[PDB]
Amino acid sequence: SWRLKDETYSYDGKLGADLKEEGKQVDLTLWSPSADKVSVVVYDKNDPDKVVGTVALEKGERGTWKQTLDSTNKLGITDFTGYYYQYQIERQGKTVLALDPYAKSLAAWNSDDSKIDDAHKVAKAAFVDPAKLGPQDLTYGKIHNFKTREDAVIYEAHVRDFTSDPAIAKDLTKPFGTFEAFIEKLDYLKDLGVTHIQLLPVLSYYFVNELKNHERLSDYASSNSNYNWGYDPQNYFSLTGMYSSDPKNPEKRIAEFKNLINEIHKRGMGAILDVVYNHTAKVDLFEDLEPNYYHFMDADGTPRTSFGGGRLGTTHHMTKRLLIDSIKYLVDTYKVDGFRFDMMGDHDAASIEEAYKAARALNPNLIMLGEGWRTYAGDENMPTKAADQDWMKHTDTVAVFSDDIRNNLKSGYPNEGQPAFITGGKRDVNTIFKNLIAQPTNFEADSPGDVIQYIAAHDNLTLFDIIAQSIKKDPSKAENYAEIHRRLRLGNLMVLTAQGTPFIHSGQEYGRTKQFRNPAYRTPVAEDKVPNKSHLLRDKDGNPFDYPYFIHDSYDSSDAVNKFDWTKATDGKAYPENVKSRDYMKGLIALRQSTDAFRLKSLQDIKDRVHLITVPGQNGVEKEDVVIGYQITAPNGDIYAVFVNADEKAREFNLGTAFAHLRNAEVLADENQAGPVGIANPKGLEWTEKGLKLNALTATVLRVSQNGTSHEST
Ligand SMILES: [Ca+2]
Ligand code: NA
Ligand code: NA
């Protein structure tokens, strides 16, 4: 029983291998209460296959094992730095090789060798001292335009994707797809105006061959690729080697990642780490350490499983401190600015709340968010409050993604690809309004800061591709490309002016695609050739698009699928529509940052200040429609208004006497541009007798500045 094991062996002392005396000594502590013996196997720093020696540990308090390696070793080592190790643990006459769960770095890891021998089944840890690596001045972000969670603008990027486009090889001075190559494209992000860059999992993950990390994955593939998003966790303190200049040097990834974080900070941004504590890649990672303990279990003690590995049981004392120690070590070592929890609804609320508190005590401006789906499994017959969307009414700490706004604007599970608000499918106007004020309909958000507002992310089809599928129009036709971009800008404007915390998938700003443009796949292929995780996109007549296969889950896809396209993102001669959308997103960000009208800090303040103008059923607005219009009274007394016409015809928005004051407003966004300065000659708008008319697929934002108003009418 894990609960009984806790009463008898709950240990709160230090764990891991602490490299001491400029490398002359190492102190080792492992928790393994059921072990009969525990030795450390030391592998050579130059040839990790070679065992240099094995040293017995001795029993310590509360189920731990401990040893000091020093001067007096007969390993022939005078500096331990860079040597590798595993624990050899004996139980009931059986011996296993286990990974130190508190390993601070690792040997280059290649899962294609995992069957060779027991020493290859899991990574080997490295003795390293992170404090002495990287910029010694690294500290927490001083993040521009940011005071509290509602002021964050999050940008979700995978480290490889962000510099894996062969088109930028000419400009890169560091190995593509690494932490230091990422630095070289940071100015684009500073210029975009985002506040926090959320990176896909940088902690060590299992299914990958890090020895091929400099190889270009240039053939289209959507399965069996060396590429990995990283959701197959191996260790919660060590960085993967996949984004390192040299995976074989266990200190380099740490220095390089410190350098990356410091450069993000120098540019006035912060870093958020995607972390995957909900499950490990392999049951044995932790079962080999202590049997029938670390994972959520059936009543008989069988480890419960998720994504092919063990569900970590964060209610259990040593699993709880694994999560918490990991969060603290990552904040203090790498000075990050927040975390995004994967499958956060799998965890007990108490763990997630305690991680938040611990992290904030180190970095008082740190923020968190997570996938709050209702997914809790836990221990059999041990119901527990989970850190899911229903936790939001009980806490004002960690936010959750809002599937209500994503689904209602452009579809999501179940029902992916069904027309929705920006894709030709009428939706309940009050449901759209409530979402835009950070009041989703599927959970109770009693703070706009509880709500991460988004329409695209790394999973599912990209905003560009899901729009193309939904409206059923082939982007290879110029007029359809333009239309898709109109709809993408409208969706982006809805999110960037919504209450709550907006979240931007890397590439959403320009209309990134995951179309499987393999020359052999121009037209539909035989069923046994169909690319894994694809949809075959069709026009309204049911004709395939040109290159009809689009990847909707690119977790196991090559760079040809996953690269961020820098030519579409930045070369406005070659791709004027994409760059126009990018610049539309930059301006929308600048618009949001210019006023706190779009980022009110309480529910009560949103109730007082935000009012629906397009009342469903009145004045040409149907109960369910593809238009919406609303007003905000900003805290300084200025009046903003957002109007969206997602119909394929011109639509009128009725102002009457109640909203007549919007007639002498500056236009901050129109069909071409967005930003904080009034647009000289606004396009797509027409003032009429009843109010305001927008062109088809057009959105606008208005501002009335009280400093230009009458002294007498008052
Ligand atoms: Ca893969
Ligand atoms: Na999708
Ligand atoms: Na996208």
Domain at 479, CATH number: 3.20.20.80
Do 313 and 343 share a structural domain?
Answer: yes
Q: Which residues of 307-320 are buried (b: 16+ CB within 10 A; e: fewer)?
A: bebbbbbbbbbbbb
Tokens for 6? 């806790």
Q: 456: CA distance to ligand 3 center in Å?
A: 5
Same domain, 277 and 363: yes
Decide which of 106, 128, 150 is a domain's last residue: 128
For residue 135, count other CB atoms closer than 10 A to its CB.
15
Please state, in angstroms and rounded to a whole number, the distance separating the CA atoms of residues 303 and 296. 6
**Residue for token pair 């932790």:** 286
How many helices and strands, by DSSP H and E, does the chain display? Answer: 15, 32
Task: Please confirm, yes or no, whether 7 is among the known catalytic residues.
Answer: no
Where helices occur in 510-665 by DSSP H, the ranges are 559-562, 566-570, 576-593, 603-609
Breaks in the chain (C–N beyond 2.5 Å) sit after none
Burial of 155-166, coded b for 16+ CB within 10 Å and e otherwise, reads bbbbbbbbbbbe
Q: What angle do CA 161, 531, 403 make, to 5 degrees?
A: 60
Distance, in Å, from the CA atom of 214 to the CA atom of 194, rounded to the nearest integer, reads: 29
Rounded CA-CA distance 123/100 in Å is: 9
Q: Which residues pair with 125 in a beta bridge?
A: 85, 106
Cβ atoms 633, 639 nearer than 8 A: yes
Indicate which CATH number applies to the domain containing 65: 2.60.40.10
331 SS3 class = helix
Question: Could you give the CA distance from residue 480 to residue 476 in angstroms, rounded to a whole number?
Answer: 7
Phi and psi of 545, rounded to 5°?
A: -60, 155
Q: Torsion over CA of 303, 309, 313 and 317, rounded to 10 degrees?
A: 90
Backbone angles phi, psi at 558, to 5 degrees: -80, 175
Nearest ligand (C-alpha, residue 503): 3
Which residues have beta carbons under 5 A from ligand 2 (an ion)? 416, 460-461, 552
- C-alpha of 698 from chain center: 29
CA of 202 from ligand 1 middle (Å) equals 15
Task: Please tell me whether residues 168 and 247 are part of one structural domain.
Answer: yes
User: DSSP of 166-212, one letter per residue?
Assistant: GGGTTT-SS-TTSHHHHHTTHHHHHHHT-SEEEESP-B-BSS-BGGG
Torsion of CA 343, 349, 351, 355, to 10 degrees: 80
Residues 599 and 656 in one domain: no
The type of residue at 397 is: T
SS3 701: strand
Longest Cα–Cα distance in the chain: 94
Out of 161, 371, 404, 509, the active site residue is 371
Are residues 215 and 69 part of one domain?
no
Helix (H, G, I), strand (E, B) or coil at 639: strand
State in Å: Cα 539 to ligand 2 middle: 17
How remote is the CA of residue 173 from the centroid of ligand 2, in Å? 36
What is the number of structural domains in the chain? Answer: 3
> Which two structure tokens, joined as six digits, stand for 707?
């400093």
Which segments within 605-673 are labelled E, that is strand?
610-612, 624-625, 627-633, 639-645, 651-654, 666-669
DSSP conformation letters of 454-517: -S--SSSS-HHHHHHHHHT--TTSHHHHHHHHHHHHHHHHHHHTSSSEEEEETTTTTT---B--
C-alpha of residue 211 to centroid of ligand 1, in Å: 14
On whether both 513 and 385 belong to a single domain, the answer is: yes
SS (HEC) of 69-107:
ECCCCCCCCCCCCCCEEEEEEEECCEEEEECCCCCCEEC
Helix axes 576-593, 478-496, angle to 10 degrees: 10
Question: What is the residue whose two structure tokens read 């029983």?
Answer: 1
CATH number at residue 620: 2.60.40.1180
Q: Which of 298, 327, 326 is nearest to 313 (CA)?
A: 298
Question: Helices 403-410 & 463-471, crossing angle to 10 degrees?
Answer: 40
SS3 state of residue 662? helix
Tokens standing for 471? Answer: 């409206």
Whose atoms come closest to the Cα of 578: which ligand? Answer: 3
Assess whether 551 and 651 both reside in one domain: no
Domain that holds residue 697: 611-714
Query: Are both 86 and 7 inside the same structural domain?
Result: yes
CA–CA distance from 216 to each of 160, 177, 509 (Å)? 11, 9, 25
The C-alpha angle 149, 154, 157, rounded to 5 degrees, equals 150
Structure tokens at 641: 């208004």
Ligand number nearest CA of 414 is 2
DSSP state of 686: E
SS3 547: strand
Any idea of the CA torsion for 104, 105, 110, 114, to the nearest 10 degrees? -40
Q: Give the C-alpha separation, 234 to 259, whole Å.
A: 23
Residues 6+ apart with CB under 8 A from 373: 343, 345, 388, 389, 403
CA separation for the pair 149, 399 (Å, rounded): 9
Can you read off the two tokens belonging to residue 442?
Answer: 């599927």
Q: How far is CA 139 from the centre of its chain?
A: 22
How far is the C-alpha of 626 from the C-alpha of 133, rounded, in Å? 54
CA angle in degrees (0–180, nearest 5) for 473-478-484: 45
Q: How far apart are CA 493 and CA 101, in angstroms?
A: 44
C-alpha 412 – ligand 3 centre gap (Å): 14
| CA 230 to centroid of ligand 1, rounded, Å | 9
Distance between CA atoms of residues 347 and 384, nearest Å: 9
* Residue 164 and residue 65 share a domain: no
* CA proximity to 687, closest of 704, 665, 658, 706: 665
Alpha carbon separation from 623 to 191, 285, 619, 628, 698 (Å, rounded): 40, 54, 11, 11, 20
Domain end, chosen from 588, 610, 632, is at 610
- Give the whole-angstrom CA distance, residue 264 versus residue 253: 16
d(CA 632, CA 639): 6
d(CA 667, CA 175): 45
Q: Are residues 314 and 346 in the same domain?
A: yes
DSSP conformation letters of 359-390? HHHH-TT-EEEE---S----STT----BSSGG
Q: How far is the CA of 415 from the centre of ligand 2 (A)?
A: 9
Number of residues assigned to the chain = 714
Per-residue tokens: 96: 């296993």
Q: Are residues 390 and 253 in the same domain?
A: yes
Domain-ending residue, one of 610, 639, 666 = 610
| Buried b or exposed e, range 669-680, using 16+ CB within 10 angstroms | bbbebbbbeebe
* Structural method: X-ray
d(CA 428, CA 443): 17
- Residues facing 612 on adjacent strands: 630
CA distance linking residue 407 with residue 397, whole number of Å: 25
Distances (CA, A) of 672 to 422, 588, 664: 17, 12, 20
Distance between CA atoms of 48 and 443, rounded to whole angstroms? 51
Alpha carbon of 52 to ligand 1 centroid (Å):
32
Amino acid at 489: R
666 catalytic per annotation: no
Which ligand neighbours the alpha carbon of 455 most closely? 3
* Interior/surface letters 513-545, b for 16+ CB within 10 angstroms, e for the rest: bbbbebeebeeeeeeeeebebbbebeeeeeeeb
**Cβ 666 vs Cβ 709: under 8 Å:** no
- 368 and 376 Cβ atoms separated by less than 8 Å: no
Ligand 3 center–CA 5 separation, angstroms: 47
The three-state secondary structure class of 27 is strand
Tokens coding 547: 């290159």
Backbone angles phi, psi at 636, to 5 degrees: -85, 0
Candidates 210, 263, 342, 483; catalytic one: 342
In angstroms, rounded to a whole number, what is the distance separating the alpha carbons of residues 338 and 327? Answer: 10
Rounded distance from Cα 168 to ligand 2 centre (Å): 29
| Judgement on whether residues 174 and 66 belong to the same structural domain of the protein | no
